Amino acid sequence: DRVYIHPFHLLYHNKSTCETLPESTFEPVPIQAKTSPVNEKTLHDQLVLAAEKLEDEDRKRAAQVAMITNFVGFRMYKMLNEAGSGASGAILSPPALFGTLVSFYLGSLDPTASQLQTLLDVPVKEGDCTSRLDGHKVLAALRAVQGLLVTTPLLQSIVVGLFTAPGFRLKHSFVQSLALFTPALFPRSLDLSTDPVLATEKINRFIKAVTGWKMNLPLEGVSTDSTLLFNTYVHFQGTMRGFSQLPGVHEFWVDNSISVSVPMISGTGNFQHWSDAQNNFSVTCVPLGERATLLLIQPHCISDLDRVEALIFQDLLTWIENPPPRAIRLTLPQLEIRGSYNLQDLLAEDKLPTLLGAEANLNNIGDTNPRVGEVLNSILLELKAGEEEQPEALDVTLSSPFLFAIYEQDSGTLHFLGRVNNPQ
Amino acid sequence: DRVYIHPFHLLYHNKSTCETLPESTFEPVPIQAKTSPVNEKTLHDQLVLAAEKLEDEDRKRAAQVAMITNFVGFRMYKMLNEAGSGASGAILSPPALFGTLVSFYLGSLDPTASQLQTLLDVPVKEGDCTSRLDGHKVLAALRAVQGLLVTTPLLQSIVVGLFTAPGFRLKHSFVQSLALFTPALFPRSLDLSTDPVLATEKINRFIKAVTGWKMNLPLEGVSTDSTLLFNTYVHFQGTMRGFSQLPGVHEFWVDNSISVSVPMISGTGNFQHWSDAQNNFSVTCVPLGERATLLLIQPHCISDLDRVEALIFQDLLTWIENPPPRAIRLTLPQLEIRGSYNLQDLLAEDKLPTLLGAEANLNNIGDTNPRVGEVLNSILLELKAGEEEQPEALDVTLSSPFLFAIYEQDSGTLHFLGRVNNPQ
Ligand code: NA
Ligand code: NA
Ligand code: NA
Ligand code: NA
Ligand code: NA
Ligand code: NA
Ligand code: NA
Ligand code: NA
């Protein structure tokens, strides 16, 4: 019934740890300040160092962070579908959402700190700090699983834009904590309280410029009394080794009566594929690198999609199986998936409208208690055909709505889940 | 002739190391703020951890920091004697003076940074940062030699009081560097520019209160335009295992015609003792712990004291010898030695009146270039008889002026040198 996670290796172990130097602060530079674009290869090459040498302890921590990441991802994915999110489908990144939540937790104090911990499904003992998550162990374990994911060009980049009102000063230890989540961190100041819509225009133009990513960011304005926005931007890029684009276009059914003609990619490899008898769906796994897997889930028929989605995406992956690979001809739409949601909305959908509300104790973020506006998570996920265009096998053809997940075998972390209703 | 030290292990090795977050700062709390006294046992127990586990590399660094510490100590001891320092004698701590100099170096930029490096006798290549000292390696190597020194109650405590004018903000990375020199670091703000004498009264009362040390601090006022004072306070405490106080009092000759009757301690042990034939002085070494040694140097006669002092305290310890220990009855004054000097005065005596002068680039200390007043080093050195009062051996009796040094065998670091002219 009520599942609890007991991530012992991510807790504080020294009661004493939890007559003081005043904490140091800085003022972020204005959003207009000249900034070099993020180098996605420099980020990659680093994350790869941070997964290279790992003792047994590190893998124990990475296994426990995986469980909390997945569970919270499943819960927020459920919140996402209840709020409704565009016709093309849904997409969510548990590592990014989880990273966001842990960043706030690092800036928070009670009651907010234990409320974030409860959300994450870890028990709290009122009075006992050694039952509390150590956010630094958590972010460090999350960095390692990001590293394991990306071991030809296989990219995942997380960028954080931290937008504050003029005069709001950030605490040093807070921002140094955020660097563990991602080194690509841009604290910037701008006038939030006079033209919400142009403030969003500035953030969108800023993000496009430091990343070069074509993301379709939301255009809605910031609430005029916001002093802190915390936006997380995710770029995933994979190549399908040996898949190439097929000639012309092919029917993809949006539902039983409506089709769209789209470009498909196709490839033949040794993949794993099974049919689930109990619930009547099938699954295909294609490797993206040495540790990453793409899972493609097909309902037997279109009207069974919601039932299947709710089975499989909601807390262990009881349904992942490990059959012998077999010769498979896989045909699917080239995936260029864009998504964005405000964590505030998902939290409100989860009956926690005020967790990050006006009374949240976030006093470890800066010099005053911030007043948090949006907390966006945005994704660009790109699966590219590994080859240009121009033997017995089983045909799997994704020509109607399906679900997908990108998954890392060692930790068990789901890095993405989603649903394609209409590629376009 | 011109000696140069080439401490390769203390330099920067990565040229790249030497589009930026604004640096974080804080305002120190006012000098009146309620402060718990330093725990000298908590400091000791830590320094002892920091010397416990040390790879070969660490000892290589510690050997090189020793050379720079000794040489600069010898040079400043010479500066001290040229300026003249009270009738009872002289005392200087090379580790404390060196630590002070390196702290400034960490806060400095060119030309000041290379001028501090030149002072320390290390070559500089204009343009090449990999010829520069890495202050963090330096302070860390200095921490380890402090640790080796203190391995029954054998104490050495270094406290730093960093006194700034109201509104002057310290940089975070600067103060975190200073913590490597000593964790007992008290940045405090007070009005310097209205009553220099009461400002010194406040600092003296502050220091007495956080330490409990009876130090006889200087009473001179701060120059009215000072915004930064950097004062280092040193407490050394040793017990002479098996020495006890002798009945009554005994003649100590201040020069050939004048004596003072003082209490002496005395003890019989296996100590090392030799006569230097070439220069006609003798030396006795008594162990203070497992790594520390006291060296007692006697000139053959009182008028030869200056000559001998200048031979022995000015850059290698060519004159330290290692004979078989022998039965020695050592009689000497109980030593309670107090000393204080302003590094500014010694620097001016060394023809560097402006190294830390008004134009010194110290922009990595805080938000404005500080204007440095005094840089005091003060010492309380206490050698206690190891027992209360009530067998053939050689009598060594220190009944006229002599020199002393406290020395650590592994690194070769001199932690104190001095001269006793009059114990009182
Ligand atoms: Na652990
Ligand atoms: Na801090
Ligand atoms: Na385990
Ligand atoms: Na924490
Ligand atoms: Na080295
Ligand atoms: Na900093
Ligand atoms: Na060597
Ligand atoms: Na340095």
Strand partners, B234: B158, B379
Q: Do B175 and A21 touch (CB under 8 A)?
A: yes
Alpha-carbon distance of B324 to B285, in angstroms, equals 11
| Chain B residues in contact with A36 (beta carbon < 8 A) | 19
Alpha-carbon distance of B304 to B312, in angstroms, equals 12
Nearest by CB to B19, which of A22, A24, A36? A36
Nearest by CB to B26, which of A24, A35, A36? A24
Give the nearest chain B residue to A172 (CA atoms). Answer: B24
Cα(B23) to centroid(ligand 6), Å: 5
Nearest by CB to A22, which of B23, B26, B35? B26
Cα(B10) to centroid(ligand 5), Å: 6
Enumerate residues preceding breaks in chain A (C to N > 2.5 Å). 18, 151, 314, 390
Ligand nearest to the CA of B177: 8
Instruction: Write the CA distances from B203 to A127, A174, A222, B339, B379, integer angstroms.
Output: 40, 33, 50, 17, 16
Find the angle CA(B226)-CA(B230)-CA(B232) to the nearest 5 degrees.
150
Interface residue B26 vs chain A (CB under 8 A): yes
Q: Do B24 and A172 touch (CB under 8 A)?
A: yes
Alpha-carbon distance of B202 to B221, in angstroms, equals 11
Strands (E) in B202-263, as ranges, are: 228-245, 250-253, 259-262
Q: What is the resolution of this structure in A?
A: 2.4
Q: Which strands make up the sheet holding A170-171, listed edge to edge?
A: A170-171, A25-26, B25-26, B170-171
Experimental technique for the deposited model: X-ray
Alpha-carbon distance of B138 to B115, in angstroms, equals 17
Q: One-letter amino acid identity for A240?
A: M
Tell me if residue A411 falls in helix, strand or coil: coil
- Asked whether the CA dihedral A387, A389, A395, A396 is positive or negative, the reply is positive
Give the tokens for residue B86.
């009270």
Ligand nearest to the CA of A172: 2
Alpha-carbon distance of A196 to A211, in angstroms, equals 23
Give the nearest chain A residue to B186 (CA atoms). Answer: A21
Instruction: Write the CA distances from A34 to A161, A187, A210, integer angstroms.
Output: 15, 13, 10
| Chain B residues in contact with A169 (beta carbon < 8 A) | none
Label the pairing between strands A264-276 and A376-387.
unpaired
- C-beta separation of A187 from A162 below 8 A: yes
Domains, in order of start, for chain A = 65-93+242-334+390-424 (2.30.39.10), 94-241+335-389 (3.30.497.10)
Name residues with Cβ closer than 5 Å to ligand 8, which is an ion: B 135
Alpha-carbon distance of B407 to B398, in angstroms, equals 19
Residue A403: closest CA among A78, A83, A82, A90 = A90
Name the minimum distance, in Å, from the CA of A185 to any CA of chain B: 10
| Chain A residues in contact with B29 (beta carbon < 8 A) | 22
Give the nearest chain A residue to B34 (CA atoms). Answer: A19
Q: What are phi and psi of B336, to 5 degrees?
A: -125, 95
Interface test mutation site (partner B, options A16, A23, A24, A188, max chain B beta carbons within 10 A): A24
Contacts of A227 (CB under 8 A, 6+ apart): A164, A165, A168, A192, A368, A370, A371, A372
Number of H helices, E strands in chain B: 9, 18
Nearest by CB to B36, which of A19, A22, A36? A19
